[PDB]
C-alpha cells in the first residue's frame, strides 16, 4: 500500500457500562487534537470504546493492562 | 455509537492514484475539521475543497 491511513480516532459519546474486562487487548489516549481527552479501549473485535477517564472501572482497567 | 469517530487533522498534500481508490466518507460534522476520506483498506485524509477530490468522488459514484 502507497499510503498508510492517517485519520485520528476521536471521541463524542463515553460507553456507560463497564467493558467485559476480558475482552480488551489493548487501550490509549485519543490525541489531544481530539475535542474531547477520552479512554479508548480495543476490544477483541477490534472495536474501538471510548470511555471517560474519570469513571472508577477505566481508572482500574487502566492500570491492570499495563500489568502482566 | 460510543465508538470512536475517525477525524482529520491534516489532508494529503497531492491527488492519490485513483486506481487505488474503493470508497469515500465524510468525516462526521462532530469532528473539527471538515474532510473526505478516502478508502482504500487504508483511509487517507483529503481536502473536500480541492478539485480531484471533487471530481474523485464525481468518477466513484458514477
Known amino acids: 500500500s502507497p499510503y498508510?491511513?492517517?485519520?485520528?480516532?476521536?471521541?463524542?459519546?463515553?460507553?456507560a457500562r463497564p467493558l467485559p474486562r476480558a475482552?480488551?487487548?489493548?487501550?490509549?489516549?485519543?490525541?489531544?487534537?481530539?475535542?474531547n481527552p477520552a479512554v479508548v479501549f480495543v476490544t477483541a473485535a477490534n472495536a474501538q470504546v471510548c470511555a471517560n477517564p474519570e469513571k472508577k472501572w477505566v481508572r482500574?482497567?487502566?492500570?491492570?493492562?499495563?500489568?502482566?
Do not use: V
Not at 498508510?4 to 460507553?15: L, N
Not at 482500574?60 to 502482566?68: F, V
Open 60 to 68: 482500574e482497567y487502566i492500570n491492570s493492562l499495563e500489568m502482566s
Open 23 to 35: 475482552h480488551i487487548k489493548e487501550y490509549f489516549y485519543t490525541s489531544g487534537k481530539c475535542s
Open 4 to 15: 498508510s491511513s492517517d485519520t485520528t480516532p476521536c471521541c463524542f459519546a463515553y460507553i
